[PDB]
């Protein structure tokens, strides 16, 4: 019956297809490539990447999440790796580049097993069982720290470990202490939750990186509304308003009919009476400085100046609520509702002026116990400011994680080596063809020490074998890679500390993503 070419799928002549191991193999290749891009950016001796945007802008960065975010990729496996990194960033905040390396190593190691005649579902099941064994072993070697305001030393050490890999390491003791102080000032301890809307991070170019400081108050990009107002107050009583300094206006449609001369004169008197009334209402309550969300008028401005009462104009809503929380005041929508109990108190309010430019800034400091805190970043480049912001965010996220759960492990590859030993020891008792998958998991779990050694300039295989032999001989899981060449392999005295939830998340998330990748055998995509 001559089965001549007949049409089944629309645009059948242009679409492509891949079936079987070849498709599978292609996926692996893509994954490996992505991992081999990130491998060099791991550890305290890692280097950085420079991304040029689609419009020409330049970004120098070290974060895995940002790196994978700014890349424009076409392969679907690359996009899956990007999303894995983004999810790890979303929950934990640190460890965004270890997870992609681990996933790439896992996929690479699965290749030889696929070549020997193993169903990929079996490989996925073996990986899952090995991951469960590793996670069960991980919390057995973990120690608690203690989270309390009095001591703050373990937290500083943890932040130091997190910041040691960034360009901010020239002053990372200072920044670590800043981060721990900010988190301890903002955090809620009964509910064990922190809120990042109460931490304001902002930077201004110029000066030096060491000029970065912590302000237990507010700082806004505004100034006083009249050029002849005083530039500082020292006993500030803040009145926070949401209504503009204008005569009232109804919202619904309205018309005011003027039908005579007496009506004209009455309206003329009413205007200035309203202005004087609002100024007197502000002054009577005892206030000393006024803050408004909207604009003023010339008459209102001169009346504020003449009555020795400075004011600020056109400040935003989030700034209003931050000032209200910091100074302990309340937000009022009318002058009639202003009372003496609704004023905030601030020890100092100042207008700071930077260098030869015309800009100004307003700082509110010496408040009482405050739930709002600001980080003020300086530096000589814009890229420096951006990277400092990212590093500070990493440190804050790590301290938050320590607040949630207070037990830690030791880094430098000690935890991975111990987990690999446990996985191999367990795999030696499994005879049901699953020992190969477990040994593949154990072998791929050892790419982090090798990457660290290769980046540090040592020889990977010999160093890893020596540390493994020492860990088996002695009975401490705290031996890692001496990256900074301080002589000792012990990470407990070198004070290299990591959170437990970070490690658990890395392992589980990488394993599940690998399992999802292994399941795919077909792919259809249009041509170009």
């Amino acid at each position: 019956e001559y089965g001549r070419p007949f049409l089944i799928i629309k645009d059948q002549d242009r679409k492509s297809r891949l079936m079987g191991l070849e498709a599978l193999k292609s996926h692996i290749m893509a994954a490996k490539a992505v991992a081999n891009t990130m491998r060099t950016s791991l550890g305290p001796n890692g280097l950085d990447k420079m991304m040029v945007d689609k419009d020409g802008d330049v970004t120098v960065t070290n974060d895995g999440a940002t790196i994978l975010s700014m890349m424009d990729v076409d392969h679907q496996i690359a996009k899956l790796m990007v999303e894995l990194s983004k999810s790890q960033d979303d929950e934990i905040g640190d460890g965004t580049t270890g997870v992609v390396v681990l996933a790439g190593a896992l996929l690479e190691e699965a290749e030889q097993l696929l070549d020997r005649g193993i169903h990929p579902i079996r490989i996925a099941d073996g990986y899952e069982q090995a991951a469960r064994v590793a996670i069960e072993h991980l919390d057995k070697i973990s120690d608690s720290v203690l989270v309390d305001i009095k001591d703050t030393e373990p937290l500083i050490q943890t932040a130091k470990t997190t910041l040691g890999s960034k360009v901010v390491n020239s002053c990372h003791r200072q920044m670590a202490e800043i981060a721990v102080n900010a988190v301890l000032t903002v955090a809620d301890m009964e509910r064990r939750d922190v809120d990042f809307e109460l931490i304001k991070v902002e930077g201004k170019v110029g000066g030096r990186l060491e000029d970065t400081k912590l302000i237990k108050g507010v700082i806004v990009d505004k100034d006083f509304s009249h050029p002849q107002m005083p530039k500082k107050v020292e006993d500030a009583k803040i009145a926070i308003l949401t209504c503009p300094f204008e005569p009232p206006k109804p919202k619904t449609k309205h018309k005011l009919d003027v039908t005579s001369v007496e009506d004209y004169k009455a309206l003329q008197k009413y205007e200035k009476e309203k202005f004087e009334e609002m100024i007197q209402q502000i002054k009577e309550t005892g206030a000393n400085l006024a803050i408004c969300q909207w604009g003023f008028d010339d008459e209102a401005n001169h009346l504020l100046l003449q009555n020795n009462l400075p004011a600020v104009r056109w400040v935003g809503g989030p700034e209003i609520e931050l000032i209200a929380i910091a100074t302990g005041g309340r937000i009022v929508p009318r002058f009639s509702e202003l009372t003496a109990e609704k004023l905030g108190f601030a020890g100092l309010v100042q207008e700071i002026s930077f260098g030869t430019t015309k800009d100004k800034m307003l700082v509110i400091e010496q408040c009482k116990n405050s739930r709002a805190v600001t980080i003020f970043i300086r530096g000589g480049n814009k890229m420096i400011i951006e990277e400092a912001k990212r590093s500070l965010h990493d440190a804050l996220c790590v301290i938050r994680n320590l607040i949630r759960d207070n037990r830690v492990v030791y880094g430098g590859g000690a935890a991975e080596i111990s987990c690999a030993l446990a996985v191999s020891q367990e795999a030696d008792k499994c005879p049901t063809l699953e020992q190969y998958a477990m040994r593949a998991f154990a072998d791929a779990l050892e790419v982090i020490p090798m990457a660290l050694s290769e980046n540090s300039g040592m020889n990977p295989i010999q160093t890893m074998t020596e540390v493994r032999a020492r860990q088996v001989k002695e009975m401490n899981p705290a031996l890692g890679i001496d990256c900074l060449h301080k002589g000792t392999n012990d990470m407990k005295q070198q004070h290299v500390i990591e959170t437990l939830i970070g490690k658990k998340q890395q392992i589980s998330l990488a394993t599940q993503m690998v399992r999802m990748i292994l399941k795919i055998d077909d792919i259809r995509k249009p041509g170009e």
């Binding site: 019956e1 089965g3 007949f6 049409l7 089944i8 799928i9 629309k10 679907q76 996009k79 899956l80 999303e83 894995l84 983004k86 999810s87 790890q88 979303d90 929950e91 169903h119 899952e128 509910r191 939750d193 809120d195 809307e197 949401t242 009232p248 206006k249 109804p250 919202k251 619904t252 449609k253 309205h254 018309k255 005011l256 009919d257 039908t259 009506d263 309206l267 809503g317 989030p318 609520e321 209200a324 929380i325 309340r330 937000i331 929508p333 009318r334 589980s508 998330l509 599940q512 993503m513 399992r515 999802m516 399941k519 795919i520 055998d521 077909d522 792919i523 259809r524 995509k525 249009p526």
Partner: protein, 521 residues
């Protein structure tokens, strides 16, 4: 020839060749989803014109995303959609069944046999098979209050055995069963909310016997009001609370400045009247589908209350059902019988987002899922997998009969039909024989996907069934045959009954077409 009958460009085909071509196309359609069946089934990735990708193991989804344009092939997509609509599980078995029915009778069509004999044979065979399935299915009249949950758990576990969440099926099955023990007597699917939050492990998913929903856009002052309550009263509203014009048709004409000031004060008095009416009822949490202004936000903050605006309608109805109030479009009568009551309200950080939780309601006809994953397609596939189990549990609650899976019922029906065929003479015998032989494509595909030798297993199964072993199917892990009713591989009989009826209907419809005509454009 001077003037032609039809418009130029009309394409016509008729005879045996077009029927053979249709049968050929159905084979390609069935091959598209052939290797996604069983505990050892893979899944497919499809990319569309815009670039978005989708990864799925569900047959109906894959058939939907394929841009099939062959008129004979569209029937297999239609029957898959119908099976998905009716029972919710079994949308790949029906496709393979229909294709096998066509392929086994292709050679008879080649010999010049009238298709109506084939149609009659198919109808008789389908009737006999459905009657046998209804006869041999296992049921318990007064089972238990505990043996009625275990059956649903086994059904869900079997329904999840070939999906991405197989390894955690024992963890998920339990949950879904609970989900359907709270859904009243109508079992509305809109009463179960599915929420997907990026970041986290698959074992961190949770079920809340209550309600939870995302944070909405908020104005200044939202951060100065409490975020935990112990015995709150909830006011559910459909009223816009902000300073605005009373009506779009309104217009104000005034002659004196005193009346101007009075008009200015009137709007504030109205808004404050609404706010005091809300406050004096004793409520601590207020929710509204319509916006809440900043003045209202600060007013509520100053009196230690919580507010939310622009809440989605489905979430508000779900909250009504969970807590037990009523949506109010007016504030002139907020009685104690129109307010909700929960046991804990909280706002919590979940992986980069803020979620509001109402928990602790024992009178709730609603549950909510929170799914934790690592990428968008991951949670989408998790939800698609859970939907099958939900539908299976709903169907199993009403009619409770169970048959064994793995291919036991296919081989039992095949043996029964073969034993019946030897009785009758003529071409009916050959056609019933072909129908009987077409039913063993399910165990063969299971074995082929697993990676076994299908011939040996099929021979052993046939010998076991002919002797005596009613519930004997394939053991994938032990690579052998085994009793699938003692290994707890259970499924409702509705799945098989509907699959057989739909596949037979599709085959009969495709066989009875004589010619095809295509008009231009």
């Amino acid at each position: 020839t001077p003037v032609i009958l039809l418009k130029e460009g009309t394409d016509s085909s008729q005879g045996i060749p077009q029927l053979v071509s249709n049968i050929s196309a159905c084979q390609v359609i069935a091959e598209a989803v052939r290797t996604t069946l069983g505990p050892r089934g893979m899944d497919k990735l499809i990319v569309d014109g815009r670039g978005k990708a989708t990864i799925s193991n569900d047959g109906a989804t894959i058939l939907k995303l394929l841009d099939v344009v062959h008129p004979a092939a569209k029937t297999l997509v239609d029957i898959a959609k119908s099976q998905d609509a009716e029972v919710g599980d079994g949308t790949t078995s029906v496709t393979l069944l229909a294709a096998e029915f066509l392929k086994q009778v292709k050679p008879y069509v080649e010999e010049g046999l009238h298709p109506q004999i084939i149609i009659r044979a198919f109808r008789t065979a389908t009737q006999l098979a459905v009657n046998k399935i209804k006869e041999i299915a296992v049921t318990v009249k007064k089972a238990d209050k505990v043996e009625q949950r275990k059956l649903l758990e086994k059904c869900a576990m079997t329904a999840l055995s070939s999906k991405l969440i197989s390894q955690q099926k024992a963890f998920f099955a339990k949950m879904v069963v609970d989900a359907v023990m709270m859904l009243d007597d109508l079992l509305q699917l809109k009463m179960i909310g599915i929420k997907k939050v990026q970041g986290g492990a698959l074992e961190d998913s949770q079920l809340v016997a209550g309600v939870a929903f995302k944070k909405t856009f908020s104005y200044a002052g939202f951060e100065m009001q409490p975020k935990k309550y112990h015995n709150p009263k909830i006011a559910l509203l459909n009223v816009e609370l902000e300073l605005k014009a009373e009506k779009d048709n309104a217009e104000i004409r005034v002659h004196t400045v005193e009346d101007y000031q009075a008009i200015v004060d009137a709007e504030w008095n109205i808004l404050y009247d609404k706010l005091e009416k809300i406050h004096h009822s004793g409520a601590k949490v207020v929710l509204s589908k319509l916006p809440i202004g900043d003045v209202a936000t600060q007013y509520f903050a100053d009196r230690d209350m919580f507010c939310a605006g622009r809440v989605p309608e489905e979430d508000l109805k779900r909250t009504m059902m969970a807590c037990g109030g009523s949506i109010q479009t007016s504030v002139n009568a907020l009685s104690a019988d129109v307010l909700g009551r929960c046991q804990v309200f909280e706002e919590t950080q979940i992986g980069g987002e803020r979620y509001n939780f109402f928990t602790g309601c024992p009178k709730a006809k609603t549950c909510t899922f929170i799914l934790r994953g690592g990428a968008e397609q991951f949670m989408e596939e998790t939800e698609r997998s859970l939907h099958d189990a939900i539908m299976i549990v709903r169907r199993a609650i009403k009619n409770d009969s169970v048959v064994a899976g793995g291919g036991a019922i296919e081989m039992e029906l095949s043996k029964y039909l073969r034993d019946y065929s030897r009785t009758i003479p003529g071409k009916q015998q050959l056609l019933i024989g072909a129908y009987a032989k077409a039913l063993e494509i399910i165990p063969r595909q299971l074995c082929d996907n697993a990676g076994f030798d299908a011939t040996n297993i099929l021979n052993k199964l046939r010998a076991r069934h002919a002797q005596g072993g009613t519930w004997y199917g394939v053991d994938i892990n032990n690579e052998d045959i085994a009793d699938n009713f003692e290994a707890f591989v259970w499924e409702p009989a509705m799945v098989r009954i509907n699959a057989l009826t739909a596949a037979s209907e599709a085959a009969c419809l495709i066989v009875s077409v004589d010619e095809t005509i295509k008009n231009p454009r």
